[PDB]
């Protein structure tokens, strides 16, 4: 059958890029809205043939999304926080979707509102998410929620806040986060496994996958087993430190800083699960692990392994950094 056209929003993040270059490749014709199309994704996905940009911004901008989706059949929507009324601008294009008539199956990549499952704070840039999801619900077209696990690569000796691996002066690497050094968190290799395991929702089609909640994660891993994953890629000393507040070496949008101490309370104080839903978490009987769907829709996946052995070293000298020689 005639590959069916995508309308993205997101393009230039890891989960949009991923999706289209995958998805160019074969055959999918993509439309896709970006900010603006200078950047290197930009401009790399630009000069993909089968790929279309967009150009403008999202808030208040109807026409743009009435434009994305025009002769679109699939959809894989993931918003961000940055331009302020996300809740706003999830409603708006769902909306938009559904005027267009011709969109089958709708992804959007949600979060949890972690306040509705304990004593915890919503985690700000996560929570507004999950009201998208609950609006675009209740559409008349076919949906399925994707919840992201953490980035292997946000990973990088550079200051930034959070994932960290700051390479000591005898050459060791040390982690410092809020996180329990044994509780288990998912990790998503997003550049390489998100675009295969998308597509393959699409492939499936919206009446295996309308309604569902899909952990977009093939990996649990501690903080202390991330850190044994980069010794072993590296052949370095990398030990996980936990710390009560995220060390911030940088500034920071204020945004940032806010999501960053809900993070504090949630998984430094709370030790609360990154993915609280409970579908999240005999002879014969074997329960369903979190990692388990995502797996089935893509065996291709990479571990953090993989990722600071043969990644890592790369994205690292292209910021600048000398420890790889
Ligand atoms: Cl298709
Ligand atoms: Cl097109
Ligand atoms: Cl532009
Ligand atoms: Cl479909
Ligand atoms: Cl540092
Ligand atoms: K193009
Ligand atoms: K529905
Ligand atoms: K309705
Ligand atoms: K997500």
């Not at 994704?41 to 808030?59: C, K, S, Y």
């Not at 597509?199 to 891993?221: C, M, S, V, Y």
């Not at 329960?287 to 790369?314: H, N």
Request: aromatic share 10%.
């Amino acid at each position: 059958q005639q590959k069916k056209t995508i309308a993205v929003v997101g393009a230039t993040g890891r989960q949009g890029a991923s999706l289209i270059r995958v998805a160019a490749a074969v055959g999918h014709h993509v439309r896709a809205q970006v900010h603006s199309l200078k950047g290197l994704i930009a401009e790399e996905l630009q000069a993909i043939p089968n790929v279309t940009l967009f150009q403008g911004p999202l808030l208040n901008n109807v026409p743009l999304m009435d434009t994305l989706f025009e002769g679109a059949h699939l959809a894989f929507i993931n918003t961000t926080s940055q331009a302020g009324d996300e809740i706003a601008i999830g409603k708006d294009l769902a909306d938009a979707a559904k005027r267009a008539g011709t969109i089958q199956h709708y992804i959007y990549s949600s979060m949890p509102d972690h306040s509705l499952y304990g004593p915890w704070p919503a985690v700000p840039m996560w929570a507004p998410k999950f009201t998208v999801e609950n609006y675009v619900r209740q559409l008349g077209l076919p949906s399925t929620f994707v919840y992201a696990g953490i980035y292997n690569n946000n990973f990088t000796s550079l200051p930034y806040p959070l994932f960290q691996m700051e390479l000591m002066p005898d050459g060791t690497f040390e982690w410092h986060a809020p996180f329990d050094p044994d509780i288990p968190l998912p990790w998503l290799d997003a550049e390489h496994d998100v675009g295969p395991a998308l597509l393959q929702i699409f492939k499936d089609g919206p009446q295996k996958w309308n309604g569902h909640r899909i952990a977009l994660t093939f990996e649990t891993l501690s903080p202390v087993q991330v850190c044994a994953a980069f010794s072993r890629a590296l052949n370095r000393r990398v030990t996980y430190v936990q710390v009560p507040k995220v060390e911030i070496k940088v500034n920071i949008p204020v945004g940032y800083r806010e999501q960053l101490e809900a993070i504090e309370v949630v998984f430094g104080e709370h030790k609360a699960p990154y993915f609280p839903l409970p579908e999240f978490s005999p002879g014969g009987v074997i329960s369903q692990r979190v990692t388990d769907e995502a797996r089935k829709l893509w065996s291709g996946w990479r571990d953090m392994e993989e990722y600071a052995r043969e990644v890592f070293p790369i994205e690292e000298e292209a910021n600048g950094l000398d420890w790889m020689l």
